């Protein structure tokens, strides 16, 4: 009634950035689908010398 | 005319200081070397009769 009335008396809000580091960008991109048939390609250039072993030594 | 107040609790004597506000006006007539008449009106909150 008196004395203190003078003065006065959720889910998801799905934030996404969070405490990680920060991020850099750079465009001097991708020389390295080449070495992908390079290697693939030597590797059959292997065999196929293995292959001139064998059919000299056949003779 | 009636009034309330509601007001905080004091813990000590106090007073509503209460302004009835009115106009308070004299109007000064010196006819005569050395006589000055002056007329007063409150109103409303006159005094006199």
Do not use: C, W
């Not at chain 2, 009636?2 to 000064?28: G, N, S």
Request: hydrophobic share 45%.
């Amino acid at each position: 009634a008196a004395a203190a009335m003078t003065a006065t008396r959720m889910p998801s809000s799905g934030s996404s950035p969070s405490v990680p580091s920060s991020i850099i960008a750079e465009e001097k991109l991708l020389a390295l689908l080449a070495e992908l048939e390079a290697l693939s390609r030597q590797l059959a250039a292997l065999t196929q010398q293995v292959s001139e072993l064998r059919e000299q030594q056949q003779q | 005319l009636d009034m309330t107040f509601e007001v905080d609790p004091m813990d000590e004597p106090t007073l509503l200081y209460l302004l009835f506000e009115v106009f308070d006006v004299v109007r000064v007539h010196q006819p005569h070397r050395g006589v000055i008449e002056a007329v007063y009106l409150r109103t409303p909150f006159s005094a006199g009769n």
